[PDB]
Amino acid sequence: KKKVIIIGAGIAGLKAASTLHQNGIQDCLVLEARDRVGGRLQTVTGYQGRKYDIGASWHHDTLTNPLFLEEAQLSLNDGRTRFVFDDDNFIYIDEERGRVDHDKELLLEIVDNEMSKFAELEFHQHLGVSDCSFFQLVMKYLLQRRQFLTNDQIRYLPQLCRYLELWHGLDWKLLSAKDTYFGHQGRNAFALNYDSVVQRIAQSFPQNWLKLSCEVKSITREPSKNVTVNCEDGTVYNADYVIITVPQSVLNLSVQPEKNLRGRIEFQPPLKPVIQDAFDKIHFGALGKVIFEFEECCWSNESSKIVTLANSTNEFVEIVRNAENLDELDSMLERETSVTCWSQPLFFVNLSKSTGVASFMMLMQAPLTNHIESIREDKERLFSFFQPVLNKIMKCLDSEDVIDGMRPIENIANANKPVLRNIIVSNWTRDPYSRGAYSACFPGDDPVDMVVAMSNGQDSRIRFAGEHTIMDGAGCAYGAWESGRREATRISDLLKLEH
Amino acid sequence: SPAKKKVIIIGAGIAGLKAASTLHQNGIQDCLVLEARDRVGGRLQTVTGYQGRKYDIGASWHHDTLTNPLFLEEAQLSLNDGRTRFVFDDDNFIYIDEERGRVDHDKELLLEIVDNEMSKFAELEFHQHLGVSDCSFFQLVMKYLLQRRQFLTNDQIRYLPQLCRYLELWHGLDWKLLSAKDTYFGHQGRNAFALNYDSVVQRIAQSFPQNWLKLSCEVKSITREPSKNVTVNCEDGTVYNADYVIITVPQSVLNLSVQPEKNLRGRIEFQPPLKPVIQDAFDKIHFGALGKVIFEFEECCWSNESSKIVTLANSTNEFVEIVRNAENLDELDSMLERETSVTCWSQPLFFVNLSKSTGVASFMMLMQAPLTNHIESIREDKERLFSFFQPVLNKIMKCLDSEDVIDGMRANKPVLRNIIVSNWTRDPYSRGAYSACFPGDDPVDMVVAMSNGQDSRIRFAGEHTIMDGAGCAYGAWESGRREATRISDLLKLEHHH
Ligand SMILES: Cc1cc2nc3c(=O)[nH]c(=O)nc-3n(C[C@H](O)[C@H](O)[C@H](O)COP(=O)(O)OP(=O)(O)OC[C@H]3O[C@@H](n4cnc5c(N)ncnc54)[C@H](O)[C@@H]3O)c2cc1C
Ligand SMILES: Cc1cc2nc3c(=O)[nH]c(=O)nc-3n(C[C@H](O)[C@H](O)[C@H](O)COP(=O)(O)OP(=O)(O)OC[C@H]3O[C@@H](n4cnc5c(N)ncnc54)[C@H](O)[C@@H]3O)c2cc1C
């Protein structure tokens, strides 16, 4: 009865719908499990009505990013602000030493650059001769270049370089070394309302096309051409083509028994083996976010980028200087609990410099992410956990210890002191319709397989879109956006040609 | 009559020395190294200045230390004897504008960040691309600015282009003469400042029979005897005959061979003449002019925040307006037309603050063509050199919390005691710094022709005869090992039954 049925109203599904309408196609649907559109793009509201992108926040690769360029044109035409370039010189903070960024003797940034070059050479033309973890690679580097590194460099470098965990959403001992380093095609552009992006695209097509709260439970290849879709609530539909944009992790459920899993779609016939095997090449990371809202800014706005390094030790240096080899290094490193805010690196965006708002947008990674999200309702504990790093940051930015005012008590004493008024946490790892952040590589994974299998589709009528179905912008908002235009345009041309 | 030798190496630069070292290493005897100058090392030369202070006036750093084979060797030696042979002197650069002062690591200008974007821009422009026309590095920067103007601030559009030019000092060419395709490139790790490149030269020179070395013999001609031999004539009249010859003279010098007039210093008359493949490659590759000037002071009385300092050439706000008002590339190329002499603010200058990295109170400054040629042409007029650089020197002292320099060439003020200048564009056995690319050049051409040789017996080595480490000291070193190894392989067949 419908030309195209799109499953999922994230940026992937919405752009497709937008594209179809744009190409004169009608009788199309967008079945979304949630009670809202946007998918992993969600802008929440907190203290005094401030807004934040608890999901995607930045426009990456602004040199080639087509979605960004589109937003740029709009802004060029109407003069409105839709984004701000917030790249800045990073401020790195160690609990004991304080700031270690741009240091005349540590020069951590410089050796960090050699490290990435080292990673580049390590995997160059060799099909990744036996892959390891990002952790293993950093150790190999330290062992190989010890002769050219000071004691402090061997101590802090490995902790500084782990900011990359916040790009992938995985601890360095879980991250694939081969995929760790990547090149960004230009500066990043912090979106000032990714919801504005969602809204514009969402409005692009006939509203009656949208069907919220439709959890698709099964897709069947109607042995007669058309495809049939059923939403948990009973309703059944049928269309010429279907575009499945559910996240990789959710789609991965289809290869298990008992369609009992929330979100799991029942494919009939099942998804061909080329697809099933693709999932063996790992994926899904866990990038999390915690927003810290203060009454107002009373600290230095030198930079909008800040990272706290996990604790490190001088004994680590000694072990590195003494290891006779890689094996001896591993064993020696083996030193036999309890996680704290100083157990992993943490990335903070000081929103005051870039947007004027007195709040910090912090990024976290697996395994910390699921732990912090698990206790997202317990603000008291959340504060206790991050208080020590929140205090060190304020001390390094010419201010003082944070005052807990989540349960306010107006006091004049808190004149020039930072007053925390609210904490917000993401929930992606616990949300069944997302089950994590976005595709990521565990040592031994090959991302290309999924892209190929996905972009090829189950068959002529069952296509796939989403951040896990494309090479350029993979795992990125613009990637999904473009993958959405891809499927739409393809079906759009086929329909126009039919006669 | 003419002495019979197995292998004759022309030139005692690093290429030639490594060639000889390798031959000996492989047990080859009765060889010879003929060098025109009265010293070995070639473009590797360490001079002495004020109070016995030493400076490399030619090569100074070990580049690409992650894979540089020469550096790895030097490092192995220091690991076993504890002697210091080099020092990793990379640092955060200090950028200075004449009117504005320091503009580095600036929280509002964020020049370094857009510079990274610029390079990525260049990378995407070429690389992995076929049929892409090259242009000047300058034009490339103009294209970036026009294309990203919507995301650049006025001050960024004004200063970024001037900071981007630090790259001129890596090529020894002004941004309008530099091939954009070759501007950017990969650095395999940090750089290590040699604490005596001459120290590297000596070790290699001493690793083979000392009676092999014949300095002060300028070779005038090389002839292949159709009888399977090569005759080599020195200017002093001595004649030699050898089975193989490895020619390592500079590309600019070898170039003289393809021209009439045999009375030019360094020129070698080839018979038969150099094959057309080689001759024509001289059209697709050029020679840059990286130059040096050492400013020696009594003592340090300035900040040692960094060992790397760069002064940007003057810029104007009118430039900005033009980038803002341009309608397209052509439009911009047009408007950029103005109706006067060169000064120290007319181009970027790179200074190495040796006081931090070596503890010596001096500045090692690098300059590029066309400035290099003009500065070397007046290197004997110290007073004139000082007047020319005084303003950038003062501006620097100001930014490093000090005061105007005092001419002391004849309490807390910087006193200039001596000035040393390079001479590579004038030395007939050098005629420039090293191989460089003009827009449209194809260096692969010369490399291929050189590495293939004139014929089985007449081979070539040098910084211009190899891809990996092209233009670098370790590239010349490897090219030397390459030719020696090939020859050893061939002479190996002599002992088969
Ligand atoms: C914390 C975080 C930060 C990020 N930051 C950035 C960033 O700064 N820049 C960037 O470029 N990218 C970022 N990303 C990635 C980016 O958000 C995603 O790549 C992109 O949003 C994926 O889009 P999508 O349209 O494929 O799916 P959307 O989630 O991403 O999901 C597709 C839709 O399918 C629906 N669905 C699932 N199961 C069913 C079912 N059974 N029936 C019906 N509907 C179903 C979902 O509810 C959803 O609406 C971030 C991701 C996270 C988690
Ligand atoms: C100012 C400057 C700075 C530099 N800095 C660096 C740096 O930091 N790092 C780096 O890696 N590289 C640097 N280089 C480049 C490096 O010095 C060269 O790549 C390398 O020294 C070239 O070695 P070569 O053995 O091929 O030739 P050498 O000049 O380079 O020359 C070979 C020899 O041939 C001799 N010769 C010439 N004609 C005749 C003849 N007719 N008869 C007999 N002998 C003859 C010469 O006198 C010479 O000794 C720099 C170069 C310059 C000019």
Domain limits, chain A: 1-84+189-282+433-499, 85-188+283-432
The count of C-alpha atoms lying within 13 angstroms of the C-alpha of B219, restricted to the half-sphere facing its C-beta, is: 30
Q: DSSP class of residue B210?
A: G
A190 phi/psi in degrees, rounded to 5: -65, 115
Q: How far is residue B324's CA from residue B412's CA, in Å, rounded to a whole number?
A: 46
What is the Cα gyration radius of chain B? 24
CA of B42 to the centre of ligand 2 (A): 5
B385-389 long-range Cβ contacts below 8 angstroms, 24+ apart: B385/B293, B385/B419, B385/B421, B386/B416, B386/B419, B388/B343, B388/B344, B389/B293, B389/B295, B389/B344, B389/B365
Which residues does chain B have within 8 Å of residue A62's beta carbon, measured at their own beta carbons? Answer: 151
Helices (H) and strands (E) in chain B, counts: 17, 23
Ramachandran bin of A446, using left for φ above 0, alpha for ψ from -120 to 50, beta for the remaining angles = beta
Four-residue CA torsion sign, A172, A173, A174, A177: positive
Angle B132-B133-B135 from CA coordinates, rounded to 5°:
130
B231 phi/psi in degrees, rounded to 5: -100, 130
Which residues does chain B have within 8 Å of residue A64's beta carbon, measured at their own beta carbons? Answer: 124
Tell me whether residues B105 and A117 touch, CB distance under 8 A.
no
Tell me whether residues B187 and A117 touch, CB distance under 8 A.
yes
Q: How far is CA A91 from CA A59, A351, B496, in A?
A: 22, 14, 67
Which residues does chain B have within 8 Å of residue A104's beta carbon, measured at their own beta carbons? Answer: 91-92, 305-306
Inter-residue contact B487 to B23 (CB < 8 Å): yes
Q: Which residue, A173, A154, A44, A164, is CA-closest to A107?
A: A154
Q: How far is CA A406 from CA A1, A373, B409, in A?
A: 53, 18, 69
Token pair 């033309």: residue: A125
Q: Which residue, B149, B221, B247, B141, is CA-closest to B483?
A: B247
Q: How far is residue B96's CA from residue B309's CA, in Å, rounded to a whole number?
A: 8
Angle A247-A253-A258 from CA coordinates, rounded to 5°:
150
Alpha helices in B56-136 (DSSP H): 69-81, 111-125
Nearest to A110 among B117, B124, B190 (CB): B190
**Closest ligand, as measured to the CA of A6:** 1
Q: How far is residue A142's CA from residue A62's CA, in Å, rounded to a whole number?
A: 34
Pick the residue from chain A with its C-alpha nearest to B82. Answer: A147
Q: How far is residue B179's CA from residue B187's CA, in Å, rounded to a whole number?
A: 18
Q: How far is residue B217's CA from residue B235's CA, in Å, rounded to a whole number?
A: 6
Residue B46 structure tokens? 């360490």
CA of B80 to the centre of ligand 2 (A): 29
Angle A271-A273-A276 from CA coordinates, rounded to 5°:
70
CATH topology agreement for domains B1-87+192-285+429-497 and B88-191+286-428: no
Tell me whether residues B107 and A303 touch, CB distance under 8 A.
yes
Q: Whose CA is nearest to atom 5 of ligand 1?
A: A56
- Best residue of A187, A301, A305 to probe chain B, by most B CBs closer than 10 Å: A187
Alpha helices in B184-254 (DSSP H): 197-205, 251-254
Q: How far is residue A383's CA from residue A244's CA, in Å, rounded to a whole number?
A: 40
B117 phi/psi in degrees, rounded to 5: -65, -45
Helix (H) or strand (E) segment spanning residue A454: helix A448-456
Q: How far is residue A122's CA from residue B189's CA, in Å, rounded to a whole number?
A: 13
Neighbouring residues of A113: CB distance < 8 A, sequence distance ≥ 6: none
SS3 content of chain B, % helix, strand, coil (to 5): 35, 20, 40
Inter-residue contact A21 to A28 (CB < 8 Å): yes
| E-only strand ranges, A426-478 | 462-464
Helix (H) or strand (E) segment spanning residue A394: helix A379-396
Way the structure was solved: X-ray
Pick the residue from chain B with its C-alpha nearest to A300. Answer: B107
Q: How far is residue A172's CA from residue A169's CA, in Å, rounded to a whole number?
A: 10
Q: How far is CA B307 from CA A157, A333, A362, B106, B402, in A?
A: 21, 36, 35, 18, 16
A252 C-beta closer than 6 A to ligand 1: no
Nearest to B79 among A85, A147, A183 (CB): A147
Token pair 């430039």: residue: B319
Mutation pick for ligand 2 pocket among B249, B254, B267 (CB with most ligand atoms within 8 Å): B249
Alpha helices in A279-378 (DSSP H): 314-322, 326-333, 351-355, 368-374
Q: How far is residue A172's CA from residue A154's CA, in Å, rounded to a whole number?
A: 16
CATH class of A85-188+283-432: alpha beta
Tell me whether residues B189 and A118 touch, CB distance under 8 A.
yes
For chain A, breaks with the C atom over 2.5 A from the next N come after 336
Does residue A163 sit in helix, strand or coil? helix
Does the domain at B1-87+192-285+429-497 match CATH 3.50.50.60? Answer given as: yes
Residue A412 structure tokens? 């004049």
Amino acid at B348: P
Q: Which atom of ligand 2 is nearest to the CA of B433?
A: 53
Helix (H) or strand (E) segment spanning residue B311: strand B308-311
Q: How far is residue B118's CA from residue B166's CA, in Å, rounded to a whole number?
A: 13
Inter-residue contact B39 to B220 (CB < 8 Å): no
Mutation pick for ligand 1 pocket among A37, A41, A235, A246 (CB with most ligand atoms within 8 Å): A246
Does residue B10 sit in helix, strand or coil? strand
Residue A480 structure tokens? 């999904």
Q: Which residue, B173, B408, B386, is CA-closest to B293?
A: B386
Amino acid at A458: Q
Inter-residue contact A481 to A10 (CB < 8 Å): no
Four-residue CA torsion sign, B174, B177, B180, B184: negative
Smallest CA–CA separation between B120 and chain A, in Å? 6
Q: How far is residue A198's CA from residue A37's CA, in Å, rounded to a whole number?
A: 8
Neighbouring residues of A43: CB distance < 8 A, sequence distance ≥ 6: A51, A52, A53, A54, A55, A193, A194, A195
Angle B139-B140-B141 from CA coordinates, rounded to 5°:
90
B246 C-beta closer than 6 A to ligand 2: no
Q: Which residue, B239, B221, B244, is CA-closest to B1?
A: B239
- Best residue of B61, B66, B103, B306 to probe chain A, by most A CBs closer than 10 Å: B66
Amino acid at B366: L
Angle A318-A321-A323 from CA coordinates, rounded to 5°:
100
A246 C-beta closer than 6 A to ligand 1: yes
How many other β-carbons are positioned within 10 Å of the β-carbon of residue A423?
20
Which residues does chain A have within 8 Å of residue B73's beta carbon, measured at their own beta carbons? Answer: none
Does residue B22 sit in helix, strand or coil? helix
Pick the residue from chain A with its C-alpha nearest to B112. Answer: A89
Neighbouring residues of B29: CB distance < 8 A, sequence distance ≥ 6: B6, B209
Q: Which residue, A308, A291, A289, is CA-closest to A169?
A: A289
Q: How far is residue B437's CA from residue B281's CA, in Å, rounded to a whole number?
A: 12
Specify which residues A79 forms β-bridges with: none
Token pair 């004169």: residue: A24
How many other β-carbons are positioned within 10 Å of the β-carbon of residue A405?
18
Q: How far is residue A128's CA from residue A122's CA, in Å, rounded to a whole number?
A: 8
CATH of domain B88-191+286-428: 3.90.660.10
Q: How far is residue B424's CA from residue B58's CA, in Å, rounded to a whole number?
A: 8
Four-residue CA torsion sign, B463, B467, B473, B476: negative
Helix (H) or strand (E) segment spanning residue B157: helix B154-164
Q: How far is residue A288's CA from residue A166's CA, in Å, rounded to a whole number?
A: 9
Q: How far is residue A214's CA from residue B469's CA, in Å, rounded to a whole number?
A: 62
Burial of B352 (0-12, 13-18, 19+ CB in 10 A): buried
Q: How far is residue B445's CA from residue B468's CA, in Å, rounded to a whole number?
A: 14
Alpha helices in A25-181 (DSSP H): 66-78, 108-123, 134-145, 151-160, 165-168, 177-180
- Best residue of B117, B124, B191 to probe chain A, by most A CBs closer than 10 Å: B117
Residue B171 structure tokens? 């090529």
Which residues does chain B have within 8 Å of residue A87's beta carbon, measured at their own beta carbons? Answer: 110, 113
Q: How far is CA A4 from CA A45, A129, A242, in A?
A: 34, 44, 6
Burial of A110 (0-12, 13-18, 19+ CB in 10 A): middle
Tell me whether residues B92 and A102 touch, CB distance under 8 A.
yes
CA of A85 to the centre of ligand 2 (A): 46
Q: DSSP class of residue B173?
A: B
Could you please state the CATH topology (level 3) that the domain comprising A1-84+189-282+433-499 is classified under: FAD/NAD(P)-binding domain (3.50.50)
Residue B392 structure tokens? 């950038």
